[PDB]
Ligand binder design. Structure first.
Ligand SMILES: [Ca+2]
Length: 223
């Protein structure tokens, strides 16, 4: 996260750090929702580690659990459909994060969090950083990315005018969230891609969770 600040221990307890260098959110206590590009494909896999319960990755309080299976979005090919579920060997006993099933919240100011670089080509962070980034319409985002944007599957956020605050390398797979009408956190995006980090005219692109909600809920049931 570029232009970020330290999140407090316990602020976003649903966050997990994945061993390949991606963030994730606890969809279920033993199911991590992350990006498709963080994994190589679906199947049994006990090679991933999820670190949950701490803002400080070096914390002795860290909970580290191994995966058992991975379900990448069917047909992922690098264009859209940027989501995957990771089944854990054991539950991480922390609050989960609800996902958006409608588009009612795909607007306003979102919060992003991660242990990714705080600058282009910078290094991974020890402590979880957070930032607020505003929604950018598909049209304004398209004015920047052209045909690379899959409007129905992607939601943009950031400051088109000045840049300055954004997600960056290593933040991928992390949730982009905000409060719902019940003042509960709700997941509207997955960190997916962008050109550079925090540059004027290039907002961050995120998986538009509302589009894939049903697909995700169903896959989660079979895991
Ligand atoms: Ca969109």
């Amino acid at each position: 996260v570029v232009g970020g600040t330290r999140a407090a221990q316990g602020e976003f307890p649903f966050m997990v750090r994945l061993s390949m260098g991606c963030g994730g959110a606890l969809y279920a206590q033993d199911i991590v929702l992350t990006a498709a590009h963080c994994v190589s494909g679906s199947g049994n896999n006990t090679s991933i580690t999820a670190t949950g319960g701490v803002v400080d990755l070096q914390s002795g309080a860290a909970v580290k659990v191994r995966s058992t299976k991975v379900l990448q979005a069917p047909g992922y090919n690098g264009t859209g459909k940027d989501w995957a579920l990771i089944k854990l060997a054991q539950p991480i006993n922390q609050p989960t994060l609800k996902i958006a099933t409608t588009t009612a919240y795909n607007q306003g100011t979102f919060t992003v969090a991660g242990w990714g670089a705080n600058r282009e080509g910078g290094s991974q962070q020890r402590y979880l950083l957070k930032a607020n980034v505003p929604f950018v319409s598909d049209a304004a985002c398209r004015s920047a990315y052209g045909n690379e944007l899959v409007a129905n599957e992607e939601i943009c956020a950031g400051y088109p005018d000045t840049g300055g605050v954004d997600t960056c390398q290593g933040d991928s797979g992390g949730p982009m969230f905000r409060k719902d009408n019940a003042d509960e956190w709700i997941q509207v995006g997955i960190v997916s891609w962008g050109y550079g980090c925090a540059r004027p005219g290039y907002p961050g692109v995120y998986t538009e969770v509302s589009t894939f909600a049903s697909a995700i809920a169903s896959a989660a049931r079979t895991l």
